[PDB]
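Hi again,

Forgot to attach this to my earlier email, sorry! This is the prediction with nicotinamide-adenine-dinucleotide bound. I've pasted everything inline since the attachment limit keeps bouncing my files.
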Amino acid sequence: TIALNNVVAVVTGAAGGIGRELVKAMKAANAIVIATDMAPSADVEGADHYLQHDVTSEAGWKAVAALAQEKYGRVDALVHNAGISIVTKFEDTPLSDFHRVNTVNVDSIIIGTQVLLPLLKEGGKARAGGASVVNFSSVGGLRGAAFLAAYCTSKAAVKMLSKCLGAEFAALGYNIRVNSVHPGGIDTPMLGSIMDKAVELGAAPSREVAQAAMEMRHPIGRMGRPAEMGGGVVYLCSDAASFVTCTEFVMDGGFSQV
Amino acid sequence: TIALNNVVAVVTGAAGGIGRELVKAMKAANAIVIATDMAPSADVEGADHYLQHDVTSEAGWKAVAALAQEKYGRVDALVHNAGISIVTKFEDTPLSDFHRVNTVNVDSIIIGTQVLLPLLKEGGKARAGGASVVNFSSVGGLRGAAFLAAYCTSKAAVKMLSKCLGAEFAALGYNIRVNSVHPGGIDTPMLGSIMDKAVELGAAPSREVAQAAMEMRHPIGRMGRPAEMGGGVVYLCSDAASFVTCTEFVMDGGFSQV
Amino acid sequence: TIALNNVVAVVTGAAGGIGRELVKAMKAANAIVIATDMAPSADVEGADHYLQHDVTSEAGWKAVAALAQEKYGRVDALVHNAGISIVTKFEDTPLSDFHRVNTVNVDSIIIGTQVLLPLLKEGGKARAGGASVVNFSSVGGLRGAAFLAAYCTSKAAVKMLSKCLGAEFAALGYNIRVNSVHPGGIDTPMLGSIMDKAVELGAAPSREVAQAAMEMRHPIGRMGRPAEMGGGVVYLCSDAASFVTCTEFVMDGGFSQV
Amino acid sequence: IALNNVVAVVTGAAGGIGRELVKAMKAANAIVIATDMAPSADVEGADHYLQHDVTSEAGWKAVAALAQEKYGRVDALVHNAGISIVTKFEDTPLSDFHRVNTVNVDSIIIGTQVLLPLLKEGGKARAGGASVVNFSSVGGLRGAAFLAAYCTSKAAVKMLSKCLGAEFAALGYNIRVNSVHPGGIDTPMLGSIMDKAVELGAAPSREVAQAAMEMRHPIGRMGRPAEMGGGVVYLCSDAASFVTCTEFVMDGGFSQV
Ligand SMILES: NC(=O)c1ccc[n+]([C@@H]2O[C@H](COP(=O)([O-])OP(=O)(O)OC[C@H]3O[C@@H](n4cnc5c(N)ncnc54)[C@H](O)[C@@H]3O)[C@@H](O)[C@H]2O)c1
Ligand SMILES: NC(=O)c1ccc[n+]([C@@H]2O[C@H](COP(=O)([O-])OP(=O)(O)OC[C@H]3O[C@@H](n4cnc5c(N)ncnc54)[C@H](O)[C@@H]3O)[C@@H](O)[C@H]2O)c1
Ligand SMILES: NC(=O)c1ccc[n+]([C@@H]2O[C@H](COP(=O)([O-])OP(=O)(O)OC[C@H]3O[C@@H](n4cnc5c(N)ncnc54)[C@H](O)[C@@H]3O)[C@@H](O)[C@H]2O)c1
Ligand SMILES: NC(=O)c1ccc[n+]([C@@H]2O[C@H](COP(=O)([O-])OP(=O)(O)OC[C@H]3O[C@@H](n4cnc5c(N)ncnc54)[C@H](O)[C@@H]3O)[C@@H](O)[C@H]2O)c1
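Structure tokens for the complex follow:
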């Protein structure tokens, strides 16, 4: 079966729309969940622990590692879900904007996976199927878009870092699987902000036409709900996914395949 | 949760190496399983029903439809798992060899999905997430190989048919998801026959060298076990995969991503 | 330099929209061109020879081989450009319609490449870069579409057959490169017939709305012209492409990459 | 397929591939402005050679100033400058990722922004548009152990190419943008990668590393730097007028098996 019995999971961005659904789904599969987000206080349904955590801060990652080390002595699953977007005209975008999107979307995975690597190696010894690192990319890491250069570039970087770490951790015998997840248009405040900013830049006549165009681009014919991301993350974190590493795990309503 | 409560599933090739593991995994998730294969009888563990079934025969598919119609009135999940391989020197391969591999690997999906479409539409009304059609492709439908022209070509056809049917069934409002599955090197009699035939053609010095080369090409560093395919198929057939259609669902130990 | 000095080229479908532009482009690069199509005679500008040729006929292919053998003793470039499309509702599509599209789009490449293999091996000895086989796939071989199941399936099969033949001809030491070409929406009678048939099915409100939607799906913002296919085919047929085999050569105005 | 009246800027012009790109583009009649870190180079076919750090905005502005004064446009911009490292992820400081990003990706961002006015003039000069050619890698398509920093940067190059192609078309600039994906090409960079792979103990020896890499290419050998030139000429030409956002692969079949 697909379950997370005795899985110690760290989930970042845990107070956001997708993050809360990931924590509920992982708890329903019996995971022990350390939830983290920018808010100093949060009631995340299904979290065993909540920590205030800026994923750009090595000190913040060390605090997460210290709690997991003291309470459990391993991390079995690490879900890099924290992320940002910007929507900009390339020619008006300072290099510092590219760097800021890279720092939150990519450096978070580099710093967090380095800080938690000792604990993930313990995860690799605890389960035959291995520890599991799940990196949130996007359909924007597979397919480009006008006015999303900084965001898409960062999500393609997340996708490829996932392939390289899955290959390297296997070659070094660590028994850590690494996969990228590629959501399509999910109904969250982030998608709302992207469509509003697209209208402000004059990429779309109105927010209504922007939303309709985005929906029609998905063969399934609608935005995804945050809860539609949970089962895929549970699967990847589970021993049922023991032969799944370096993979692009797509949950996009068919967006990328047409 | 990821489960198949009240899911009526048809699984073809159910007596083979992967097929038997799929039926056990789907039963363990509470599916009602109609198992079919070429043998006139079979003890398939976890099958509610076994039918003798040639997937190239429209009459055979109608007998499957008749049983599901009488007992259940719907099909919630259809797993096209029946398949064949050949390994041949292209210049020695008659057109009839391409056609034979096409008839089993591709025409099976066309004929079976057409015959079961009324029952799949009833599945689409039974579950908010939709009925689910799962087509077995291969990493050979993503990446080519010397001496596997007929097989790889058929598996690329399976992959693309899956994208087109997912898009079309969504456009027509049928609520039927369609996805392709891409196994890597799985330890089954089919992979054994491919490596033996590669030696017979003189593509590999010996079965031992063929096997080692194939293992080293997978970043995870080994062949898959047939049971490692079950979780992925359960996920795709479940309501947890409600935003997953037209997708390439890869279970390949990283083979395609390096 | 990119040129086709002393290149003996066979181009099928040579009387069609793209075919005529391929023959002109290849002649402009100094190729010797054997042009073939269904019509019993034709004035194909830049053709050294015209033959009536049904690409589904082994006897037709042997007549092409006989002319090249007598006049030149080799074939340096083979461009499989002959192709057909249908636009259908899957559930109303008889298996024979899938088979008809397969016979013209895929079996043509199998039969023709087998019959011309001895002459292509002579091409492999004539140029260090090798003989060059160019197979016309489609963006429909990369991305699926509603109501194009038979066409897209055949074009994905063309794509994968190209990868397998490139790998096999290299492994056998024949020095024959094989590549697939993937046009986007090109202004030809075939695209016209697809958009008209889409209206007849009621997939599109009108031919005007169908055309506008198709144009806006291309990032470059317009249909391609048939002449925009010629340079890419010249490049692939040339010694400049000596390190290009098994490749997807895309000329789609960005369609597949968004 | 020719580059008559094409003003081309080629970065990393003194390297293995760069020297062959300049020769190929000159042979197709381009005017070539060649740039690299070196104050001199055995670059033949360059109309102008500039010492140029592609990480420096000031360096790019000096390139723009020369093209503006001599020609008033840039028709083709080939981002070929690049570095690699080979490291164990757990031992790789964030600054190493940032250094590879600065040379491999920030170069394209800074250079394309600084040259955008001149590229818009190229967009008015040719029906097919100005052409920006970004050097990615098969490592931007497929991952590899011990190449996390390098492959990550090349996947970033690939996706930036798709976004800029889409954006410049949406804004009506008539600038095509494409990524190029070389396989294992016989250059000092591939040599450095294979040597460092041995030092980390990824390969028994340089000889075994090289043989494994050759056998991974269906064509059965490394590429020569000259085998990259025709593809870049094609993408820079009016013959490629319907080619934008594309992955232009020259890899001996590496990525497709
Ligand atoms: N296809 C798409 O464009 C698309 C759409 C939606 C979501 N996504 C993906 O889903 C993931 C979740 O996004 P979401 O839609 O829930 O957006 P969201 O803004 O609702 O949640 C993202 C979370 O990340 C947190 N976060 C941001 N910066 C942080 C930092 N420095 N430290 C710690 N936490 C930080 C935010 O507080 C927020 O809780 C993203 O990583 C993204 O890859 C992609
Ligand atoms: N990497 C790969 O290429 C790879 C590896 C393993 C499996 N697969 C795919 O997974 C699927 C399962 O294969 P497997 O490894 O279990 O092979 P298998 O031979 O063990 O099982 C295949 C089953 O299909 C049945 N079958 C064959 N022709 C049939 C017909 N005309 N009608 C009904 N049943 C028929 C066989 O009797 C057999 O039981 C196949 O589609 C196969 O192509 C692919
Ligand atoms: N995006 C796309 O899907 C797309 C768009 C345009 C073209 N294409 C492909 O490019 C190629 C060129 O097509 P086109 O647009 O010029 O169409 P076209 O109809 O103008 O030309 C196709 C030619 O093939 C010939 N042909 C058909 N059946 C034949 C047979 N049995 N024997 C010999 N010749 C035969 C026809 O006579 C015709 O001259 C085709 O393979 C097509 O599939 C794809
Ligand atoms: N498959 C692959 O990974 C692969 C193989 C070969 C080349 N490539 C890519 O092709 C391109 C050509 O590289 P090459 O193989 O000729 O390597 P090379 O080292 O021979 O040449 C690269 C050139 O770029 C120059 N350069 C480096 N940093 C610079 C800076 N800050 N400013 C200006 N110039 C700088 C170097 O001096 C060098 O001359 C690179 O982008 C490389 O990554 C990729």
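Residues A 12-13, 15-19, 37-38, 53-56, 81-84, 104, 136, 138-140, 183-186, 188-191 surround nicotinamide-adenine-dinucleotide (ligand 1) (CB under 6 Å). Chain A has one domain: 8-257.

That should be everything now.

G.
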